[PDB]
Amino acid sequence: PYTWKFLGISKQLSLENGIAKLNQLLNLEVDLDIQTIRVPSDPDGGTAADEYIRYEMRLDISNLDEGTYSKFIFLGNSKMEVPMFLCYCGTDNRNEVVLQWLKAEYGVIMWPIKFEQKTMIKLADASIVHVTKENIEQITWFSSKLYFEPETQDKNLRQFSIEIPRESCEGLALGYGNTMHPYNDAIVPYIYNETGMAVERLPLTSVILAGHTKIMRESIVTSTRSLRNRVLAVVLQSIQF
Amino acid sequence: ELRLEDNYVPTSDTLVVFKQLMKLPVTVLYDLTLSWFAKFGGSFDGDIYLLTETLDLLIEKGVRRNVIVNRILYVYWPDGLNVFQLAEIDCHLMISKPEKFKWLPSKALRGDGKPYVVKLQPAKFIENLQTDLAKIYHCHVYMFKHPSLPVLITRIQLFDSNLDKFQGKPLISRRPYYVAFPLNSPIIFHSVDKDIYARLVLQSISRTISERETIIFKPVQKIPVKSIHNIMTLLGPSRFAESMGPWECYASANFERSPLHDYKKHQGLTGKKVMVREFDDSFLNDGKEEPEIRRLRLEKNMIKFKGSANGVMSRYSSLVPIEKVGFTLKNEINSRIITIKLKFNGNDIFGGLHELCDKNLINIDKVPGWLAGENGSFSGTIMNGDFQREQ
Amino acid sequence: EWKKQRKDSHKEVERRRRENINTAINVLSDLLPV
């Protein structure tokens, strides 16, 4: 149920410097958390430039629904050419008010974000993975469902799907061997071998992990109230050029 | 006893039948109405020749269809048409617009599991079926052959009495049901409805055909099909059945001519040309191109999805378009069984896949036959490289 | 607050149950003649 929308930020604003004028503008005081995280800790992902700084800001007069619960997330890094992006959820229009304040205050210019098919697959890979307290990676399997919607003459082929239960996903990943990004590593090559179909090239519309999340063209829908850090890191790395 | 006859009049809404009538052209209206007056007459005063000249003078003056329809519904037969005419209008509607109707296949089997090739003389069948059905429900049955196919078609409609009403004594109508019989095949075609009336009907056909040995109907497919032409092509007694998709040319059978045919034009001397395949997979890797090789690449896609270089039936429309198919691959890897279930939807699945192949989103050499269109109209499971129809 | 965490954990275990039923059904189906 928890949807999301992402915007890009053209300057590494220090949000804490300006919280008060937002508060009086919004007629309420918002929280502001600070986290310096090291999300891509795997060796091939890197051990430097991992120092993303995360901000949790919330407009919770209450938390009875997403609109009241609507919480913003800023995550940035100084080495990043465009330094920071933004996330928010819910239909509440106070989000628009705070965005207006940002753009008018810091002289910053902002735009919405899109995803590519490969971006979607990478994000889905990032959604399943979890880390234990011992700093050890682990994977939780969900019944994946690829869902495409091509354009063809006379609507010959309107839509088609490839559903992959948990057992088949786990079996393909194990057959490929010990790996960390099974959807890109094993599943898609298997689909191509069995059907000659290039999932990357085909017009993907959604990647649904049943009971966990729905990844879509313009938004992320999540079972949990929040997004785990690798999701946000993947988003930021996708913002760039 | 309860068998109806052609002169009875049912009851229904006039506007619905008016809208049904408006579909037909003027000439068929003229013919139908002349025949109806010839057989039944009408409330109009005058000889059929007088009726003939009135209808004539109406048509050479360029009168609109509304006038004729209103006449039919309000002066010639104002109280309502007979059951025969109601069946005839639906017959003409089906013949004119076949694609508006849906069908399902059903296979006749006997005790030992063998196919039972049903051979039918209409008279015995119709009398036996009428006698069987009349004991339970009031039934009118109309039988006819398709103008352009070797199929006998039957229309069955059931009636019952009467919301409240006094002594008018009509019988209210109900949605009709249809069955068809190819001349020599084990297969049956019928409409798609699972109300108890359709079950009673189908059971009655199964009972009445037998006459020497027991017979039972076993469905072979779960998704309907439109356009009686198409279902006849798929499952009727023909050369295309079990030669679908890339195998259509054997059904065509025009490639080979009889042996005594002339020498010098026997195609063997003259031959043909074709393209060489490539097997090391460069598809995923990646205008710098020339016409001829591209032409034969398109021909390769054509034959892989159509079975003939000339493309025996746009370049993508297939012989029988398929709207829905569901596949389920079962493969063994490291002693572990893996399931992939593909679901497609559209107006022509394989034509769309052919278009994607032309746009180079799919590798032709790795498209399996079941994905190319063979076993057409059959959803099923593939194990050990052999297609198996779903139960 | 903790109550939402309790609800989330309960939802998670319920989802695991629901997935286990489907897994059992699939593995049972894979053995049948048809």
Curated annotation (Swiss-Prot), chain A:
Keywords: Cell cycle, Cell division, Centromere, Chromosome, Kinetochore, Meiosis, Mitosis, Nucleus. GO terms for biological process: ascospore formation; attachment of spindle microtubules to kinetochore; cell division; establishment of meiotic sister chromatid cohesion; establishment of mitotic sister chromatid cohesion; maintenance of meiotic sister chromatid cohesion; meiotic sister chromatid segregation; protein localization to chromosome, centromeric region. GO terms for cellular component: kinetochore; nucleus; outer kinetochore. Its main location: nucleus. It is found in: Nucleus; Chromosome, Centromere, Kinetochore. It comes from the Eukaryota. Component of the kinetochore, a multiprotein complex that assembles on centromeric DNA and attaches chromosomes to spindle microtubules, mediating chromosome segregation and sister chromatid segregation during meiosis and mitosis. Component of the inner kinetochore constitutive centromere-associated network (CCAN), which serves as a structural platform for outer kinetochore assembly. Belongs to the CENP-L/IML3 family. Present with 125 molecules/cell in log phase SD medium. Forms a heterodimer with IML3. CHL4-IML3 is part of a larger constitutive centromere-associated network (CCAN) (also known as central kinetochore CTF19 complex in yeast), which is composed of at least AME1, CHL4, CNN1, CTF3, CTF19, IML3, MCM16, MCM21, MCM22, MHF1, MHF2, MIF2, NKP1, NKP2, OKP1 and WIP1. Interacts with CHL4 and CTF19. This is Inner kinetochore subunit IML3. It comes from Saccharomyces cerevisiae (strain ATCC 204508 / S288c) (Baker's yeast).
From Swiss-Prot, chain B:
The keyword Cytoplasm does not apply. GO terms for molecular function: structural molecule activity. It comes from the Eukaryota. GO terms for biological process: attachment of spindle microtubules to kinetochore; cell division; CENP-A containing chromatin assembly; chromosome segregation; establishment of meiotic sister chromatid cohesion; establishment of mitotic sister chromatid cohesion; kinetochore assembly; maintenance of meiotic sister chromatid cohesion. It is found in: Nucleus; Chromosome, Centromere, Kinetochore. It holds the Pfam family CENP-N. The keyword Iron does not apply. Belongs to the CENP-N/CHL4 family. Component of the kinetochore, a multiprotein complex that assembles on centromeric DNA and attaches chromosomes to spindle microtubules, mediating chromosome segregation and sister chromatid segregation during meiosis and mitosis. Component of the inner kinetochore constitutive centromere-associated network (CCAN), which serves as a structural platform for outer kinetochore assembly. This is Inner kinetochore subunit CHL4. It comes from Saccharomyces cerevisiae (strain ATCC 204508 / S288c) (Baker's yeast).
Curated annotation (Swiss-Prot), chain C:
It comes from the Eukaryota. It is found in: Nucleus; Mitochondrion; Chromosome, Centromere. Residues 5-34 form the bHLH domain. Signal peptide: none annotated. Required for chromosome stability and methionine prototrophy. It is involved in chromosomal segregation. Binds to a highly conserved DNA sequence (5'-RTCACRTG-3'), called CDEI, found in centromeres and in several promoters. DNA-binding activity is enhanced by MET28. Required as an auxiliary factor for transcriptional activation of sulfur metabolism together with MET4 and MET28. Binds DNA as a dimer. Associates with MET4 to form a heteromeric complex which also includes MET28. Present with 6890 molecules/cell in log phase SD medium. This is Centromere-binding protein 1. The chain holds residues 218 to 251 of 351 of the full protein.
